Write a protein that binds this ligand. Structure first.
Ligand SMILES: Nc1ncnc2c1ncn2[C@@H]1O[C@H](CSCC[C@H](N)C(=O)O)[C@@H](O)[C@H]1O
Lengths: 12, 605, 48, 362
C-alpha cells in the first residue's frame, strides 16, 4: 500500500 | 486455483494472433504520418523564416547585470549582458469554476480516486492526514488491482469454474478483482450466457412507443409505468436533478365534474341510436372495422381518464366515430375490471378549521420538538396510505407542515394555512414572512404572489426565488482578499440579494472534502441543515466570490423555497453605487482568525 | 406552459410525429391534476 | 541508437531548468537556433560543428518573483519574423520577438500557472492554455482574442498538465494529476464556426465583448490507464502513446482495435491498450519526453541521467528491443528533453542549471 503514496514534484 | 493464469494462457493465444494486428495499424499509422509530415513540411517550406540576430551593446542601458553560460567542457565561457522583460499586473488566483443558478445532488463518493498535490511544506509534519483521508475513504484508493477485466470466452470459462471437473477457481474469481462480484453473479451470467447481449433499451417485453408502428397493445399501467418512474412532480419535471423515486400517483378524485351534455354531436356517436344510448347508462355487434393494438393502447389509457366521454375519444382519435369506439369501449369493458370513479364530500365542510388550532397544534409542535429551534431536516412527503396525520406523521416527526405535494389530504390541520398579508408579504406581521418560505403563489393573493408571475413589479418582497429577481454583480479583486463581488445599483436595508446557489452534498463527504479544502484553506460550503450541506466548489452562483465582514452591509437569511432549504442575502444597511459586498461567515473565533482574520479597520479611540 | 410550448414546437412534434406519445405525457398532467380537460382540446387542435 | 553526448554547458543562475524548445518552424540551411527557459531567465542558443554552441541573445525576468515553467516558439506571417512564448508560476503567456527585442503582447486571465503550451499545428496564431487552474484557454495571439475554455462543468477535478493536438488538428488530448484523459473534437462545427468569427473582431464594433464558447463534454476519457498520475502523452498520429510514473510506456486507441477515432460516440468508454516500451528509475512525475519532427524515433532521459530512447518504425513492443543511452557525469535530473530539427542533434537539459548535447553517430 506504500507504493500508492506519491509526493514527487521532484525526486523522493 | 484461479482463472488468471488460464486467462493469461487464453490472453497469450489471442495476443499471438494480434502480432500482425498490432503491426497493422502501427504500419498503417506511419502512412498516415507520411502524408501528414510532408504536407506540413510543404507549407513549412513555403513559409520563409527570418534569421535571428544577436544582441549588441545598449548604451542607455549600460547599468545592467551580466551573465555567462558555463561550458561544462573546455570551451570558452561566453558572456552576455542580462536584459529584463516587460511588466504585467498580477490578478488573484481562481479555480476554473462553472456558472450555476440551481441546485443538484451528487451521491457520496466511495472511492479516493484522487491524491491531490500540495505545496509539500506541511507534509513534513502532518503527512499522516493523507492516509487518514484514505481511512475516511476506507482504503478504497483508485487503481487498485484492476488490470482490465475478464470477458468473452474467458468470461465463459468463469462459468465452467463453478462446476466440478474446479472449486477454489470460482471462489478465487469472486475474491481478488475489485469487480469480482460473487460466484452467484457467475451463475446468473451462466443464465445470461443464453443471450450474451442486452435485449434492448426497454424491459424484455415489447413496449415500443405508440408512435412507433410496432408498438404492442400495452395495458394502461405498464404504458404509464415509464412516466411516473422517470417523472418527478415535486419539481414537476422528468428526472428532477434536485429530488430516485417519488410515489405511485393513485389518488381520489370526484368524477361528476362533467356537465354531461351528451348529444349526437358526432355521426355515429354513443347517440344517434336510442338503444345504443340506452345501453350506455346501463353498462356504466360492432362494425367490421378493426382496431390496431396501438389504437387499443390509448383505449385503456383513456378509459381511466373519463370512462364516460366516448365523444371526447372520437374528438381525440380521428380513425373512427364515437361509435365503433363506444362500441369497442363497451367491447373492451366487456373483459376488463371496473373502475373506481368515486365521489366523496368528507365530514369536515366548514368551521372547526380556525387557523389558531393549527397554532394550537403548533404549541404541541413547539412544546416537544421545535423548542431547540435548530433541529432542521430535509422535507419529505408525509404520505399516509391509510393512517391519518398521526403523531408518527413523516412531517410531524420531521416537525414541518403537511406540504401540498405530500398526501396528507386537505382536511389536515398540519397544512400551512395561508399567506393573507393584504399590504404585502414582506414584514413582521406577515407570518408567512416569518415563515422560512417564499410566499406561495397559491396563497398570497393578498400580496400579488401569483399576480403577473411574468412581470417584475409587486408590493411583496418575499417573491424573489419564484422568478429570479437577481441583481447585477461585479467581478474584480477585493479590498480584503483576492477576488471580489460588488453591486451596481443602490439598494435598501432588508432587501433581497440573489440566493447562494450551489450543489447539495452530505456532511461526511464535505467533512472529507473540507479537511482537504481546509488543507488548501477552501470553503465553498454553507451549512444547509442538520442533514445536508450545500457545495459550491465547481458549480456555483455569482455571489460565491464575495468576502467577509464582522459588520457588513448585507446578511444572509435561511430560506425554505417550496420545501427546499435555500439561502439568500439581505441588506444590513443602506447601499449606494460602488460598494463592497460582505457577510458574516459565522465560524469559530479561532477559525475566524485562521480564515477571515482581515477586518479592514483602524483604531479610532 | 401547455399552449405556449406547443405554440412553438408542435411543428417540431409534427416533424417528429410523436403525437400519439406526446399526449401520453399530456395524459399524466390531468392524472396529476396539473391541467384539466379544458386545455386538452387546445393541444390536439394545435396539432391540426 | 547510435549517438553520443558531445558537448554540455551550464548557466550560472543555478535554479532548476525548464521548458526546452527547438525552432522546428524555420527554413532549411538557415542557422538552427534552439531556446529554453529556466526559473526567470529565457534562453536562446545555437549549436555548431566542432562541438561548439554559440551563446545567443537571451533575457530574464526582473520584477515578477515568479518561476517560469513552459515555453514554445512562435512565428508571425505578417512580419515574417518568428517569435517565442513562455509560461510559468503565474501563467501569463508572453510572446517575445528577438527582432522586436520585446514581448509587446499582454494576456492575463489564468488562475494559477500554465502547465501546457502548444500552438495549433496549422494555425500559427492559436494556443490552448492548460493551467493549474483546471482550465483550457485558447488564445488568438495575432488578433489578441481569447477563445473558448474547455472542461468546466465536466472539467478536470484535479490538476492536468499533459495535452496534445493531433497533427491534422481536429482532436485534443489532455491528461494529468486526475489520471483522467479527457479529450475533445476540434472539428466541431460549433467552434469550427467560432474560430472563424474569432479570427475577426473590432473593439469598436459593439459594446459587447467577443463571446467565445464553453465546451464541457469531452469525446472520451478514462482513468484506468494509470493508477497514478499521467504526464507524458502525445499524439502518435491515429494512435496515442502514454506513460506514467510507474516507469511504463504504452499506447492506446479508443474503443476496440477496429474502431475509428472519429466515428465513436462521445458516450462510449470502452478501451483498447497496447504497447510496452518501458523504463525504470524514473518513478516521479513532471518530465517531458520527446518525439522527432519526422515521427520516426522516440526519446527520453531519466532523473538519474540516463536516456531511454527508441525509434518509431516497424519495431514494436512484441519484444521491445531496448536502447538505453547514457552518460556518467549527467545524473542529477533531466527535466526536459529536445532534439535538433532532425535525428542528428539532441540537447539533454538537467535540473542543476546544466545542459548536455547528444549528437548523431551517423
Ligand atoms: N475577511 C477576510 N480576511 C482574511 N481571509 C478571508 C476573509 N474573508 C474570507 N477569507 C478567506 O477567503 C476564503 C474564501 S474564498 C475567497 C478568497 C478571496 N477573498 C478571493 O476572493 O480571492 C476563506 O477560506 C477565508 O479563509
Amino acid at each position: 500500500x506504500x507504493x500508492x503514496x506519491x509526493x514527487x514534484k521532484x525526486x523522493x | 486455483k484461479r482463472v488468471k493464469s488460464e486467462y493469461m494462457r487464453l490472453r497469450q493465444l489471442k495476443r499471438f494472433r494480434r502480432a500482425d494486428e498490432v503491426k497493422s495499424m502501427f504500419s498503417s499509422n506511419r502512412q498516415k504520418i507520411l502524408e501528414r509530415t510532408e504536407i506540413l513540411n510543404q507549407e513549412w517550406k513555403q513559409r520563409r523564416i527570418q534569421p535571428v540576430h544577436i544582441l549588441t551593446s545598449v548604451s542607455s542601458l549600460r547599468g545592467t547585470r551580466e551573465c555567462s553560460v558555463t561550458s561544462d567542457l573546455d570551451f570558452p565561457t561566453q558572456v552576455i549582458p542580462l536584459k529584463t522583460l516587460n511588466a504585467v499586473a498580477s490578478v488573484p488566483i481562481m479555480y476554473s469554476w462553472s456558472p450555476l443558478q440551481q441546485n443538484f445532488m451528487v451521491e457520496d463518493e466511495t472511492v479516493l480516486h484522487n491524491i491531490p498535490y500540495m505545496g509539500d511544506e506541511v507534509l513534513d509534519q502532518d503527512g499522516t492526514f493523507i492516509e487518514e483521508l484514505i481511512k475516511n475513504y476506507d482504503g478504497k484508493v483508485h487503481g487498485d488491482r484492476e488490470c482490465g477485466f475478464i470477458n468473452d470466452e474467458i468470461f465463459v470459462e468463469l462459468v465452467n469454474a463453478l462446476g466440478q471437473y474446479s472449486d477454489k477457481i470460482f471462489e478465487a474469481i469472486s475474491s481478488m478483482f475489485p469487480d469480482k462480484g460473487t460466484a452467484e453473479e457467475l451463475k446468473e451470467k451462466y443464465k445470461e450466457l443464453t443471450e450474451q447481449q442486452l435485449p434492448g433499451a426497454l424491459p424484455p417485453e415489447c413496449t415500443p412507443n405508440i408512435d412507433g408502428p410496432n408498438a404492442k397493445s400495452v395495458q394502461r399501467e405498464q404504458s404509464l409505468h415509464s412516466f411516473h418512474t422517470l417523472f418527478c412532480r415535486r419539481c414537476f419535471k422528468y428526472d428532477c436533478f434536485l429530488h430516485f423515486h417519488a410515489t405511485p400517483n393513485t389518488y381520489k378524485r370526484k368524477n361528476t365534474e362533467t356537465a354531461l351534455d351528451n348529444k349526437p354531436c358526432g355521426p355515429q356517436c354513443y347517440q344517434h341510436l336510442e338503444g345504443a344510448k340506452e345501453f350506455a347508462a346501463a353498462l356504466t355487434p360492432p362494425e367490421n372495422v378493426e382496431w390496431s393494438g396501438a389504437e387499443a393502447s390509448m383505449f385503456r389509457v383513456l378509459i381511466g381518464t373519463y370512462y364516460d366521454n366516448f365523444c371526447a375519444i372520437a374528438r381525440l382519435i380521428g380513425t373512427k366515430t364515437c361509435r365503433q369506439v363506444y362500441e369497442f369501449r363497451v367491447k373492451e369493458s366487456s373483459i376488463i375490471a371496473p373502475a373506481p370513479a368515486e365521489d366523496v364530500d368528507t365530514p369536515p365542510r366548514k368551521k372547526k378549521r380556525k387557523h389558531r388550532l393549527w397554532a394550537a397544534h403548533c404549541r404541541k409542535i413547539q412544546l416537544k420538538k421545535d423548542g431547540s429551534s435548530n433541529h432542521v431536516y430535509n422535507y419529505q412527503p408525509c404520505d399516509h396510505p391509510r393512517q391519518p396525520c398521526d403523531s408518527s406523521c413523516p412531517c410531524v416527526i420531521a416537525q414541518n407542515f403537511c406540504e401540498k405535494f405530500c398526501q396528507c389530504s386537505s382536511e389536515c390541520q398540519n397544512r400551512f394555512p395561508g399567506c393573507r398579508c393584504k399590504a404585502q408579504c414582506n414584514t413582521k406581521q406577515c407570518p408567512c414572512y416569518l415563515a422560512v418560505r417564499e410566499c406561495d403563489p397559491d396563497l398570497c393573493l393578498t400580496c400579488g404572489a401569483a399576480d403577473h408571475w411574468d412581470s417584475k413589479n409587486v408590493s411583496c418582497k418575499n417573491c424573489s426565488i419564484q422568478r429570479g429577481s437577481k441583481k447585477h454583480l461585479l467581478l474584480a479583486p477585493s479590498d480584503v482578499a483576492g477576488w471580489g463581488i460588488f453591486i451596481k445599483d443602490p439598494v435598501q436595508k432588508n432587501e433581497f440579494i440573489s440566493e447562494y446557489c450551489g450543489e447539495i452534498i452530505s456532511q461526511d463527504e464535505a467533512d472529507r472534502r473540507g479537511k482537504v479544502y481546509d488543507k488548501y484553506m477552501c470553503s465553498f460550503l454553507f451549512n444547509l441543515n442538520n442533514d445536508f450541506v450545500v457545495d459550491a466548489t465547481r458549480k456555483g452562483n455569482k455571489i460565491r466570490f464575495a468576502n467577509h465582514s464582522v459588520n457588513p452591509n448585507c446578511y444572509a437569511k435561511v430560506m425554505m423555497v417550496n420545501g427546499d432549504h435555500r439561502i439568500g442575502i439581505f441588506a444590513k444597511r443602506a447601499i449606494q453605487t460602488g460598494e463592497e459586498l460582505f457577510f458574516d461567515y459565522r465560524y469559530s473565533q479561532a477559525d475566524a482568525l485562521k480564515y477571515v482574520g482581515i477586518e479592514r479597520e483602524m483604531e479610532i479611540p | 406552459a401547455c399552449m405556449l410550448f406547443v405554440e412553438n414546437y408542435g411543428q417540431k412534434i409534427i416533424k417528429k410525429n410523436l403525437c400519439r406519445n406526446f399526449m401520453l405525457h399530456l395524459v399524466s398532467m390531468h392524472d396529476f391534476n396539473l391541467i384539466s380537460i379544458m386545455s386538452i382540446d387546445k393541444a390536439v387542435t394545435k396539432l391540426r | 541508437y547510435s549517438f553520443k553526448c558531445v558537448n554540455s554547458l551550464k548557466e550560472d543562475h543555478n535554479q532548476p531548468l525548464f521548458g526546452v524548445q527547438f525552432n522546428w518552424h524555420s527554413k532549411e540551411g538557415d542557422p538552427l537556433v534552439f531556446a529554453t527557459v529556466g526559473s526567470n531567465r529565457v534562453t536562446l542558443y545555437e549549436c555548431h560543428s566542432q562541438g561548439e554552441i554559440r551563446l545567443l541573445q537571451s533575457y530574464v525576468d526582473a520584477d515578477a518573483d515568479e518561476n517560469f515553467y513552459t515555453c514554445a516558439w512562435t512565428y508571425d506571417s505578417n512580419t515574417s519574423h518568428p517569435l517565442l512564448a513562455v509560461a510559468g508560476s503565474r501563467g501569463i503567456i508572453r510572446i517575445i520577438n528577438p527582432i522586436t527585442m520585446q514581448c509587446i503582447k499582454h494576456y492575463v486571465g489564468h488562475g494559477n500557472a500554465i502547465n501546457e503550451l502548444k500552438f495549433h499545428p496549422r494555425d500559427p496564431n492559436l494556443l490552448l492554455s492548460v493551467s493549474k487552474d483546471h482550465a483550457l484557454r485558447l488564445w488568438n495571439i495575432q488578433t489578441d482574442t481569447l477563445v473558448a475554455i474547455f472542461g468546466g462543468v465536466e472539467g478536470h477535478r484535479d490538476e492536468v498538465l499533459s495535452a496534445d493536438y493531433d497533427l491534422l488538428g481536429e482532436k485534443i488530448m489532455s491528461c494529468g494529476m486526475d489520471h483522467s484523459l479527457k479529450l475533445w473534437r476540434i472539428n466541431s462545427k460549433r467552434m469550427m464556426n467560432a474560430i472563424k468569427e474569432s479570427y475577426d473582431y473590432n473593439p469598436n464594433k459593439t459594446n459587447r465583448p467577443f463571446i467565445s464558447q464553453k465546451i464541457h463534454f469531452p469525446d472520451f476519457s478514462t482513468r484506468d490507464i494509470h493508477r497514478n498520475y499521467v504526464d507524458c502523452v502525445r499524439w502518435l498520429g491515429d494512435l496515442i502513446l502514454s506513460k506514467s510514473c510507474e516507469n511504463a510506456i504504452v499506447c492506446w486507441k479508443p474503443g476496440k482495435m477496429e474502431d475509428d477515432i472519429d466515428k465513436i460516440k462521445p458516450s462510449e468508454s470502452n478501451v483498447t491498450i497496447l504497447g510496452r516500451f518501458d523504463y525504470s528509475q524514473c518513478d516521479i512525475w513532471y518530465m517531458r519526453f520527446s518525439m522527432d519532427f519526422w515521427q520516426k524515433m522516440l526519446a527520453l532521459g531519466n532523473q538519474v541521467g540516463k536516456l531511454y530512447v527508441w525509434d518509431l518504425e516497424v519495431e514494436d513492443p512484441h519484444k521491445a528491443k531496448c536502447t538505453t543511452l547514457t552518460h556518467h557525469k549527467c545524473g542529477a535530473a533531466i527535466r526536459q528533453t529536445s532534439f535538433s530539427r532532425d535525428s542528428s542533434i539532441l540537447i539533454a537539459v538537467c535540473d542543476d542549471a546544466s545542459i548536455w548535447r547528444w549528437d548523431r553517430l551517423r
